[PDB]
Write a protein that binds this ligand. Structure first.
Ligand SMILES: O=C1CN(S(=O)(=O)/C=C/c2ccc(Cl)s2)CCN1Cc1cc2cnccc2[nH]1
Ligand SMILES: [Ca+2]
Lengths: 51, 234
């Protein structure tokens, strides 16, 4: 599960009732696919700046 | 930082620098949010009054992205002990909010369990700062970064002349001439995961810098996530 390629999660991975549940850092929202994490606004945490 | 490379434009935006009355940096910090800086508790015992600078990469040329911020309140860990560097973590709340821009952005705080099993088991983490470039050399004028491999807990406990508490972890090389150093203290130790950097440590201490058979010791941030969370709302 989470031990298998982070459960396919972009960020946080937790195993609940034998299932993988993804979540994200403050400032991100879990995408519709429940794995990807989408930045809530400009300069989200953890991203090197490009402009 | 001994060895390593300099942080290129926009590469270490979470780096903050604690500066004394004479505008000289004496410790590092990590931008956690618009109002909070994470640093080493032992750094507070290094200067009476200080401010925090962000967006700096070359202390010898005002590039324009730099911003100095006054500290509203200092939050030292109640259990910090100067003798052993245990509980070496402190949070700072700034009087004014940091405006994120090029070279000024926060690092993500990870979840303890996931970070310990997934982040801290990665090959390396990244440490950075304006600290000395050699154990007896002068402080760096350019912000530097260094990839430091995580070091086996037991190999590290064995290598150290001082106690390695449960609030510490090690990173670096056994003999290779690369390591953090004086000046980088309080600075960021982060781990990259899928192009997103999470704070995993606070430059804490070491015996000299880049010494053979000696490693870099960092505050185990994952052990203080609940603490940081509380401090960032007080
Ligand atoms: O040898 C040194 C070097 N300085 S330093 O040069 O200010 C920082 C060095 C660092 C190396 C690697 C990281 Cl990470 S920070 C700190 C104190 N120090 C001695 C020392 C370490 C230590 C640990 N615990 C109790 C007492 C102690 N005295
Ligand atoms: Ca500058």
């Amino acid at each position: 599960l989470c031990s298998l390629d982070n459960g396919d999660c972009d960020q946080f991975c937790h195993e609940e009732q034998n299932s993988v549940v993804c979540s994200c850092a403050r400032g991100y929202t879990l995408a519709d696919n429940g794995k990807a994490c989408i930045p809530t606004g400009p300069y989200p945490c953890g991203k090197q700046t490009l402009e | 930082i001994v060895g390593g490379q300099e942080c290129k434009d926009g590469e270490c935006p979470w780096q903050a620098l604690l500066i004394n009355e004479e505008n000289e940096g004496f410790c590092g910090g990590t931008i956690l949010s618009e109002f909070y800086i994470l640093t080493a508790a032992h750094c507070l015992y290094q200067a009476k009054r200080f401010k925090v600078r962000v967006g700096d990469r070359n202390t010898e040329q005002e590039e324009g992205g730099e911003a100095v911020h006054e500290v509203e309140v200092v939050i030292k860990h109640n259990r910090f002990t100067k003798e052993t560097y245990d509980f070496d973590i402190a949070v700072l709340r700034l009087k004014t909010p940091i405006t994120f821009r090029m070279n000024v952005a926060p690092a993500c705080l990870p979840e303890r369990d996931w970070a310990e099993s997934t982040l801290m088991t990665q090959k390396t983490g990244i440490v950075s700062g304006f600290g000395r470039t050699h154990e007896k050399g002068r402080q760096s004028t350019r912000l530097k970064m260094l990839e430091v491999p995580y070091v086996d807990r037991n190999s590290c406990k064995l290598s150290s002349s001082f106690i390695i508490t449960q609030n510490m972890f090690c990173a670096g090389y056994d003999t290779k001439q690369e390591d953090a150093c004086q000046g980088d203290s309080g600075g960021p130790h982060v781990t990259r995961f899928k192009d997103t950097y999470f704070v995993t440590g606070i430059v804490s201490w070491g015996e000299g810098c880049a010494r053979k058979g000696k490693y870099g010791i960092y505050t185990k941030v994952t052990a203080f996530l609940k603490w940081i969370d509380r401090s960032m709302k007080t």
